[PDB]
């Protein structure tokens, strides 16, 4: 719902876009796109960057049509806006102050879930965030795992 | 023997086989040469070695040996050795 | 270079002679050397074989004016600068080298009158045009040009070319009395 | 190691065991480490690591050396069996396979290698008793890669020999740890997959039973991936694809779709695979739409993030799917680009049939290609027209309109085969780029190189196609600016990604830099000019390696192909960004072609700053990024600089505060800001200074060497003899030979010929090679006798080493030209020259040695690869393939006419191969195949041609421009084969007369269209039965007729119908039994061919209205054969004097007497036309 | 040259050989 833009956010995106498309083609490539997001100073993360590159260029041709670029960069700012809600949410699960949420709690959330899944994959996913074994399941890892790209 | 006149080219003359009892005795001789080099390696033996060997050319080639491998670990003089 | 310099260092042991005051000859051909460490520590070297290498310049003869014969052929040498401060050279081999700033070379060569022989085949001058007579006009004091001694025909045509005033001198001082013949 | 050698020579002296039971076992214990002794001593001369073109050296000794020492170990296993302990021996056997690691890369095997591998079946089977000793993890991965590569490596070798299932039964011995791709197949790997084996084995059991073609059935979807393959490759497509469509909810969806459409690729149906791919893409995109999409966190996440939890279970799976499918989607798009491109070609062939009737197109192959003047081949750019942004953007705006109407919605059937061909072509290079970028992200760098190779050979072909379209007098619907500018998008982008290619290849050291940084911020794969001279492409500098799976020469050719196009395109600073980046990775070693145009570009782009009101110079993006850092961005350190070209430090926002068109209006703002703030260095003086510093290191002659190399364009040629000293033998031959090619037509033929000849004498190292060529026989002779079957004289090996690799690449190429151009006066000296060429050609043919050497075996044998994966021919200045091809068969004609046929067959077999595989020309290949039949007719091998005739008739063994090399062939059909050693008393011979005569002019050959090639077969049948009859000695007789009157009735029984395949003329050439008189057999062969012969005469009688002095030489070549083969029929009937005086008048027509074939026919009207006439 | 020049080049090669000989002599000394 937050893949929306104004002329000024389009201004920001197209301005980072600018010195790549400089003789006129209308598109920045996925490599050019990664260099766009790196030149921002607010650099991307590699796991986010590669999968986003695969996503916005869903066909994987390299060239990215401007509507796709605008939609993706709106997604990037809604990673600041909408993903913030998810982050502060799953932060209330950080009541225990270590970086993690106890496994039975994540199992509880999964059993009360919208697009339901299966408990065995949920236990292996608990381990995928509890890669440390403190009896508790990570909070940053989880939210970036579902919302980074 | 690397003969040339007999049948096998390099003909091992049909004389002996199964040299275990004497090579075993040789094996401790090589070990005796092995430690005797360490004796020299550690002490400032020497005339005992040269008088014990007397005229055993083959055994001293082993005594000439055990220094050479040690020299190989130690020095390029092993090239001269 | 210092890895192979031991052989030069061994030269005192090779000839079994005294000391560093004995430096007269030096030979390093066929070792693809490019530049030599500063030879201003050595002594009265007068003969030098550094041919068959990949030499380019000179940063080592700072006070090595003591050299009298120099052999630097079959290299990539492009450097003749400050060599005028070492004018004691008499014979030079330079074939298969890269010298093209010829006027500045002559300006350097004006102080290198001591040269008796010089080789220039497969040097750019040997592949140029208007080359030999140009050199002779600049260098009347060099005898063995490409080790090939100058002849009177070349001298005659050089005189006719380079000083037109002197050419008309030749025609006039004899007689040159009338023009059409 | 002298002591061991005098000890090890007695080691072979014991047994070859009785000594095996006569000695002490202590010898074997100390000899086990002496097996280490024997191996490492020889390793000093063998550097036995597992990859190189010359793995250790040229083929012959390394094949012997690796095999002999392994056999010694293979002998040494039996002594280990007595000890029953092989700790170091098994370690030694590991190095024995270490020799097999490179031999498997190139799929090479020898007779005693097979002998070793044959006994290895039982020998290696006792090792599973020892395999349980498991502590070395690194050895295990080596062992699995040892097993996985080798087991199929020998098996595919035995697939050709068809004794495969017996060998797989031998493989079943070791199957206690096997499974062909157990690294990802077997799961457990020891396994016990009783459910999965029904589909894992159906990947292997089918694979072995595809010799008998077993099929599979359908499924439900989203099962284990391996279940698809039996459905996939073994039967038809409609039911196989639709199971994969159900298979949607499981990874490796496209892995098995690739295999189907690989099969569909081979079977000449690209339209359907695209047609069925749309529903696949209908899901694939809809799949993408689906996959992409305490208290309060008990609440918020469970309804906001937790729906995205399944999205990660979608997205990670999607990217886990993408992990394997990054190449599968690439192989999707690439072979779809193949499908698009091949369908583009057929639409191009539609134009010819829609445009032309009986007026086809054909041009003399003597014109040239402007690509020879490219920045790689010539090192320069001609004063041509730029693809300016004025021409680019405005045109591309029209093409985007053409692109847009295409997405929105002669000219409609000839130019729309280009537009609906663009419906492929737009997607060709889009799917190619899809096939590019996908393999570019997943580390599948090798696939990208071939995706670009498939790309390059497409555009290279299409650029050739339009040139032929322009040359053949058509309204070329595209303009050259319209065509080239399309390729710019993958030119500029492909190179930039191909730069990220090399960077990440260097990350794992798959690419090793050649030189230190020099004056640049990076090392170089080319180095700087310090490691360069006035060299050439005649690189004896070791060619590209095995594990070096990169084609840098092609990349170098492509990258500057983009660069030279870019400068024309005037993509000014994206231009220069690529130009500087390549000039940095080349360390200005190639500053002779980049910098003079880069400096020229810098002045233009420095000027373009002033035109566009460029602000103060420190504001330029490189100069603004250097303002923050301090280090000036020079022309030498531009690579890798992370310019802070930002999202907030305003662009031309004056164009944004009213950005009505957010794309175009901002593009001008994007351009202008980058044009105002330049993101590349532009210091002309710095680049010129860097240009001069590099030149000072360059040799003094390098300035003149390239200065002359530039002049190789059009007009005049006086003094190229200022360079030939050079101390470089190959370079002086090449440059001066290239000189005389123009002088060849410019009346300096003999003068330029002899000038080459002196160079050739240097190549042979002895003067006047032609006399030295007669000395041949001093150069490796040989002769048999009535004692054994030994070999004969062969001159290859000594030439093969020094004269072979390049002396045959250049001088033999010159020699082939020499025979065609020079000795046209003395015919014998042409043959003297031609035999010299053939010996040179055969020298490179003896190079491969899993194959025999005698003419007997090569008369029946063909090869698919010469050397370890690389053939040297890659450049025109090395040799011109079409000129080589033309001159080669030009030589082949006379020599086949001279009947020196034993050498012709291996050359012709070579001739046909590179045409089909490297050139992909069906017309060129198939015409040479028919020529092979004529040779077999001459000697008496009618049996073998007859067998090969059937394959030609059905298209079996017949090549194509299909990435399988072939079309879809028919059945596993097996037919009889009458043999030359079978008497008339046997029946298949006489029945073969019923089946070859009924198989007349091939149906597939009638489909060829070019009539003169259709008439070529009528020569064969006329030539077939005449020489087939010629083996018989008899006299004219009514008895040939008496047994043919019945067979007139038996053959005149027509061949019309039973439309479900029929050739009703059962001619009964078998049914009157053996008693054909020697008179009868000879004429029966004659009066069958006379049916086709009388056609050829009457066919040209229609064109005889133009008198036979102007009836085309192409037709008169037919008629010259017609008279003599009519005579050949007539001579056996004693009608001789007929052919006598027709040629008497041809003597004077010879003095009287674009298109290539027509001119080939015309130039035959010389001494040799009279030669056949005189005989 | 011609012959002369070549012969002169041969003489130069011989002189180089003699210089090497003198070097050897000095080494011996």
Written overview of the protein:
This is part of a larger assembly, with one copy of chain A (149 residues), two copies of chain B, one copy of chain C (181 residues) and one copy of chain E (29 residues). Chain A has helices at residues 7-18, 30-39, 46-56, 66-92, 103-111, 119-129, 140-147; strands at residues 28-29, 63-64, 100-101, 137-138. Chain A contains seven helices and four strands; from the N terminus they run H-E-H-H-E-H-E-H-H-E-H. Chain B has four helices and no strands. Chain B has helices at residues 20-42, 47-53, 57-74, 77-80. In chain B, helix 1 crosses helix 3. By secondary structure, chain C is an alpha/beta fold. Chain C has helices at 2-9, 11-15, 102-109, 132-138, 152-162, 164-174; strands at residues 25-27, 47-49, 69-71, 91-93, 117-119, 144-145, 148-149. A seven-stranded mixed beta sheet of chain C has the order 1-2-3-4-5-6-7, with no helix packed on it. Chain E has 29 residues and is mainly alpha-helical. Chain E has one helix at 3-28. The longest helix of chain E is centred in the middle third of the chain and has 26 residues, at 3-28. The PDB classes it as protein transport. The entry lists the keywords microtubules, protein transport. The entry is titled "In situ structure of the central apparatus in mouse sperm axoneme". Chain A is Calmodulin-1.
Notable characteristics:
part of a larger assembly; 5 chains; A: 149 residues; mainly alpha; Recoverin, domain 1; 2 domains; two-stranded antiparallel ribbon; 7 helices; elongated; E: 29 residues; rod-shaped; protein transport
């Amino acid at each position: 719902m937050a893949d929306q833009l104004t002329e000024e956010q389009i201004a920001e995106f197209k301005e980072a876009f600018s010195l790549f498309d400089k003789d006129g083609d209308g598109t920045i490539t996925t490599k050019e796109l990664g260099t766009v997001m790196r030149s921002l100073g607010q650099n991307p993360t590699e796991a986010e960057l590669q999968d986003m590159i695969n996503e916005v260029d869903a066909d994987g041709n390299g060239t990215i049509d401007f509507p796709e670029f605008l939609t993706m960069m709106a997604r990037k700012m809604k990673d600041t806006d909408s993903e913030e809600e998810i982050r502060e949410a799953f932060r209330v699960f950080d009541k225990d102050g270590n970086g993690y949420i106890s496994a039975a709690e994540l199992r509880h959330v999964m059993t009360n879930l919208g697009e339901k899944l299966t408990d065995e994959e949920v236990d292996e996913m608990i381990r995928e965030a509890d890669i440390d074994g403190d009896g508790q399941v990570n909070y940053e890892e989880f939210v970036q795992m579902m919302t980074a790209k | 023997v690397k003969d040339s006149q007999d049948v096998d080219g390099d003909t091992y003359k049909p004389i002996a086989s199964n040299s275990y009892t004497m090579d075993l005795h040789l094996e401790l001789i090589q070990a005796q040469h092995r430690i005797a080099v360490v004796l020299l390696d550690q002490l400032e033996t020497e005339l005992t070695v040269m008088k014990k060997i007397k005229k055993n050319k083959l055994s001293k080639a082993i005594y000439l040996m055990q220094k050479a491998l040690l020299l190989f670990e130690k020095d390029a003089v092993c090239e001269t050795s | 270079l210092p890895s192979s310099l031991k052989a030069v260092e061994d030269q005192l042991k090779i000839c079994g002679h005294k000391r560093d005051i004995d430096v007269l000859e030096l030979f390093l051909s066929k070792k693809e050397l490019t530049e030599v460490i500063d030879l201003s520590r050595f002594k009265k070297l007068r003969y030098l074989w550094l041919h068959h290498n990949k030499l380019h310049g000179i940063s080592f003869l700072t006070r090595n004016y003591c050299l009298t014969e120099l052999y630097l052929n079959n290299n990539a040498i492009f450097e003749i600068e400050g060599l005028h401060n070492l004018p004691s050279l008499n014979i030079l081999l330079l074939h298969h080298n890269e010298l093209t700033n010829i006027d500045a070379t002559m300006k350097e060569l004006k102080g290198m009158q001591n040269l008796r022989s010089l080789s220039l085949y497969q040097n750019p001058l040997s592949q140029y045009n208007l080359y030999r007579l140009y050199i002779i006009f600049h260098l009347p004091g060099l005898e063995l040009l490409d080790r090939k001694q100058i002849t009177e025909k070349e001298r005659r045509y050089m005189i006719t070319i380079f000083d037109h005033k002197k050419a008309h001198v030749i025609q006039s001082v004899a007689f040159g009395k009338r023009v059409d013949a | 190691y002298e002591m061991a050698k005098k000890v090890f020579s007695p080691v072979w002296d014991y047994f070859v065991s009785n000594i095996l039971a006569d000695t002490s076992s202590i010898l074997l214990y100390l000899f086990l480490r002496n097996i280490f002794v024997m191996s490492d001593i020889k390793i000093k001369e063998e550097n036995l690591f597992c990859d190189n073109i010359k793995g250790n050296e040229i083929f012959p000794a390394q094949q012997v050396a690796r095999l002999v020492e392994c056999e010694n170990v293979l002998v040494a296993l039996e002594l280990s069996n007595f000890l029953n302990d092989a700790n170091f021996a098994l370690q030694a056997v590991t190095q024995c396979y270490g020799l097999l690691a490179p031999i498997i890369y190139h799929n090479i095997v020898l007779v005693p290698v097979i002998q070793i591998l044959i006994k290895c079946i039982v020998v290696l089977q006792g090792i599973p008793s020892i395999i349980h000793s498991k502590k070395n993890i690194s050895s295990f991965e080596s062992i699995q890669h040892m097993i996985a590569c080798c087991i199929f490596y020998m098996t595919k070798i035995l697939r050709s020999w068809k004794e495969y299932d017996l060998a797989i039964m031998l493989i079943n011995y070791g199957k206690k740890m096997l499974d062909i791709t157990s690294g990802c197949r077997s799961l457990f790997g020891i396994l016990l997959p009783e459910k999965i084996n029904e589909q894992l084995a159906l990947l292997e059991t089918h694979l072995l039973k595809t010799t008998k073609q077993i099929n599979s059935a359908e499924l439900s979807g989203s099962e284990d991936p391996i279940f698809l393959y039996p459905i996939v490759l073994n039967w038809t497509v409609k039911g196989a694809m639709k199971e994969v469509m159900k298979f949607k909810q499981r990874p490796r969806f496209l892995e098995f779709f690739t295999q189907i459409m690989l099969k569909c690729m081979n079977d000449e149906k690209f339209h359907l695979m695209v047609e069925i791919s749309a529903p696949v893409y209908d899901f694939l995109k809809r799949r993408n739409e689906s996959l992409i999409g305490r208290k309060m966190a008990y609440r918020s996440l469970s309804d906001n993030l937790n729906p995205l939890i399944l999205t990660y279970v979608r997205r990670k799976r999607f990217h886990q799917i993408l992990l394997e499918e990054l190449p599968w989607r690439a192989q999707m798009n690439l072979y779809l680009a193949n499908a698009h491109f091949h369908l583009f070609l057929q639409k191009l062939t539609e134009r010819t049939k829609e445009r032309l009737g009986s007026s086809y197109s054909s041009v003399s192959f003597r014109s040239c290609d402007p690509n020879l003047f490219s920045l790689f081949h010539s090192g320069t750019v001609l004063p041509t027209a730029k693809l300016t942004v004025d021409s680019y953007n405005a045109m591309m705006d029209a093409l985007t309109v053409s692109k847009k109407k295409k997405h929105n919605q002669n000219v409609r059937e000839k130019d729309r085969t280009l537009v609906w061909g663009l419906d492929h072509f737009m997607k060709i290079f889009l799917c190619c780029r899809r096939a590019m970028v996908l393999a570019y992200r997943g580390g599948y760098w090798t696939l990208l190189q071939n995706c670009c190779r498939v790309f390059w050979n497409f555009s290279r072909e299409l650029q050739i196609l339009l040139k032929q379209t322009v040359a053949s007098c058509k309204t070329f619907p595209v303009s050259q600016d319209n065509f080239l500018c399309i390729c710019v998008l993958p030119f500029y982008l492909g190179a930039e990604l191909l730069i990220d290619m090399l960077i990440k290849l260097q990350s794992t050291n798959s690419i090793k830099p050649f030189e230190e940084r020099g004056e640049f911020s990076i090392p170089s794969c080319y180095g700087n000019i310090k490691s360069d001279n006035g060299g050439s492409s005649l690189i004896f500098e070791h060619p590209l390696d095995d594990v070096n799976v990169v084609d840098l020469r092609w990349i170098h050719d492509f990258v500057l192909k983009s660069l030279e196009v870019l400068y024309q395109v005037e993509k000014w600073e994206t231009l220069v960004s690529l130009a500087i980046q390549f000039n940095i990775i080349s360390h200005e070693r190639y500053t002779e072609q980049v910098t003079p145009l880069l400096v020229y570009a810098q002045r233009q782009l420095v000027q373009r700053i002033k035109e566009l009101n460029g602000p103060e110079l420190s504001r330029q993006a490189c100069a603004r990024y250097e303002a923050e850092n301090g280090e000036k961005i020079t022309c030498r350190n531009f690579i890798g600089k992370r310019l802070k070209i930002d999202s907030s430090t305003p662009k031309n926002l004056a164009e944004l505060q009213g950005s009505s068109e957010p794309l175009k209006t901002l593009i001008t703002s994007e351009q202008r800001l980058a044009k105002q703030l330049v993101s590349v260095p532009l210091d002309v003086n710095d680049t010129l200074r860097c240009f001069r510093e590099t030149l000072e290191k360059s040799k003094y002659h390098n300035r003149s060497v390239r200065h002359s190399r530039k002049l190789l364009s059009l007009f005049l040629a006086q003094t190229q003899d200022v360079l030939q000293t050079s101390n470089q033998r190959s370079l002086k031959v090449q440059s001066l030979h290239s000189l005389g090619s123009l002088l060849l037509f410019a009346d300096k033929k003999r003068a330029a010929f002899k000038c080459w000849s002196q160079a050739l004498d240097d190549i042979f190292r002895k003067p006047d090679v032609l006399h030295n060529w007669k000395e041949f026989g001093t150069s490796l002779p040989g002769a048999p006798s009535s004692s054994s079957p030994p070999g004969f004289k062969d001159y290859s090996e000594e030439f093969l080493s020094k004269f072979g690799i390049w002396g045959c690449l250049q001088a033999a190429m010159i020699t082939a030209k020499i025979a065609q151009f020079i000795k046209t006066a003395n015919v014998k000296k042409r043959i003297n020259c031609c035999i010299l060429s053939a010996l040179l050609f055969q020298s490179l043919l003896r190079t491969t040695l899993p194959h025999p050497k005698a003419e007997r075996n090569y008369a029946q044998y063909e090869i698919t690869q010469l050397l370890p994966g690389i053939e040297l021919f890659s450049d025109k200045f090395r040799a011109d393939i079409c000129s080589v091809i033309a001159s080669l068969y030009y030589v082949i004609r006379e020599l086949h006419y001279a009947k020196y046929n034993l050498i012709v067959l291996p050359l012709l077999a070579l001739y046909q191969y590179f045409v089909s595989v490297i050139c992909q020309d069906i017309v060129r290949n198939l015409e040479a195949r028919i020529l092979k039949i004529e040779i077999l007719i001459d000697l008496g091998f009618f049996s073998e041609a007859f067998y090969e005739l059937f394959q030609i008739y059905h298209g079996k063994n017949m090549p194509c421009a299909i990435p399988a090399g072939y079309k879809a062939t028919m059945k596993v059909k097996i037919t009889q084969s009458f043999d030359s050693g079978k008497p008339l008393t046997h029946k298949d011979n006489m029945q073969a007369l019923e089946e070859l005569i009924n198989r007349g002019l091939p149906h597939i050959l009638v489909n060829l269209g070019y009539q003169h090639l259709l008439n070529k077969f009528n020569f064969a049948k006329s030539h077939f039965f005449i020489s087939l009859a010629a083996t018989i000695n008899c006299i004219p007789d009514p008895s040939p007729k008496i047994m043919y009157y019945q067979f007139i009735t038996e053959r005149s029984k027509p061949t019309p119908q039973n439309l479900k395949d029929n050739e009703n003329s059962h001619g009964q050439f078998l049914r009157l039994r053996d008693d054909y008189n020697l008179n009868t057999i000879k004429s029966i062969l004659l009066m069958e061919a006379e049916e086709k012969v009388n056609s050829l005469l009457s066919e040209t009688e229609h064109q005889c209205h133009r008198p036979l002095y102007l009836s085309s030489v192409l037709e008169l070549e037919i008629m010259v054969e017609a008279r003599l083969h009519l005579a050949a029929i007539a001579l056996q009937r004693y009608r001789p004097a007929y052919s006598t005086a027709i040629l008497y008048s041809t003597l004077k027509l010879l003095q009287d007497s674009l298109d290539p074939i027509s001119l080939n026919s015309r130039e035959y009207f010389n001494i040799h036309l009279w030669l056949r006439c005189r005989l | 040259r011609a012959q002369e020049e070549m012969q002169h080049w041969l003489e130069l090669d011989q002189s180089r050989e003699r210089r090497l000989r003198a070097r050897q002599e000095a080494n011996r000394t």
